Design a protein around this ligand. Structure first.
Ligand code: NA
Ligand code: NA
Ligand code: NA
Length: 279
């Protein structure tokens, strides 16, 4: 029986418990740098410690993508088929690194079925892509069929978010183009573009109205929602995640949905109180 495959995801992409329990998913860790602390975004770094370090540090956190060599090493294993899921190429060097890792692999070990998916997204966008790879594999697709089906899924997939604090994204150059100080409680509803950049979709005064407007934006774009899994990541605001889930359910029916805590990289850029939605 051929499940000779592995799904490698950079650490921005959260894993559910079931994905951790599965074994076919593996993270490649990014780096996080805050003042003189240099950490690896992995399961040893607790969100609370990270949020407290962010809150204490006057200077903005910095991050680094994984190296090509780390990606190469993750490809070298007994699995015949390697699928890699990364942060948007427009937000991070993770995609390019994964690709170069494949070039190095082939120089050292020869040809292998390795495909790098640029998510054009972040966080649970990556998670959902990883789930789709597994779904395709479970359906018995060939390697190239999985690549085609997943690239199609990426094209259908849209990302939305509302944060309390956009400064880490702004200061690290991830919000370029998007112009900026009206009402102090104004909350932008942000989202992906089809190229994997960030844009502003809407805005509202206060979080309660912004979550409704976010729900409406998601609902305006979604098609064939019954075929889709909806994902919500939250940074230290589980009840806000549940309320978003409730608002979305009022607007359209999905196959299923789930909620996760933000990863290290997701926490760094979303900040305390952030909500990310993907379908
Ligand atoms: Na390294
Ligand atoms: Na206003
Ligand atoms: Na408003």
């Amino acid at each position: 029986k051929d499940m000779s495959y592995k799904v490698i995801v950079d650490s921005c992409g959260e894993f559910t418990p079931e994905m951790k329990a599965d074994g076919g998913f593996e993270h490649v860790a990014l780096g996080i740098q805050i003042e003189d602390t240099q950490w690896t975004d992995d399961d040893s770094l607790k969100q609370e410690e990270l949020l407290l370090k962010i809150a204490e540090s006057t200077s903005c956190a910095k991050t680094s993508c994984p190296s090509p060599e780390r990606y190469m090493e993750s490809y070298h294993c007994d699995a015949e088929r390697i699928y890699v899921v990364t942060l948007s190429a427009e937000l991070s060097g993770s995609y390019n690194s994964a690709v170069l890792g494949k070039n190095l692999y082939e120089e050292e070990y020869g040809e292998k079925q390795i495909h790098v998916f640029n998510s054009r997204s972040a966080s649970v966008g990556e998670t959902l892509i990883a789930l789709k790879v597994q779904q395709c594999e479970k359906a018995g697709m060939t390697f190239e069929e999985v690549v085609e089906s997943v690239e199609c899924y990426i094209e259908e997939q849209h990302t939305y978010f509302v944060l309390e604090n956009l400064d880490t994204l702004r200061k690290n150059g991830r919000l370029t183009g998007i112009k900026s100080a009206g009402a102090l409680n104004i909350k932008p509803i942000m989202g992906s573009t089809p190229q994997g950049t960030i844009c502003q979709k809407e805005k509202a005064r206060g979080m309660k109205k912004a979550l409704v407007k976010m729900a409406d934006c998601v609902a305006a774009d979604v098609v064939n929602a019954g075929d889709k899994i909806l994902a919500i990541a939250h940074c230290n605001c589980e009840e806000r995640a549940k309320e978003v889930q409730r608002l979305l359910k009022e607007r359209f029916a999905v196959k299923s949905s789930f909620i996760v805590d933000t990863s290290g990289i997701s926490t760094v850029y979303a900040n305390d109180g952030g909500i990310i939605v993907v379908v």
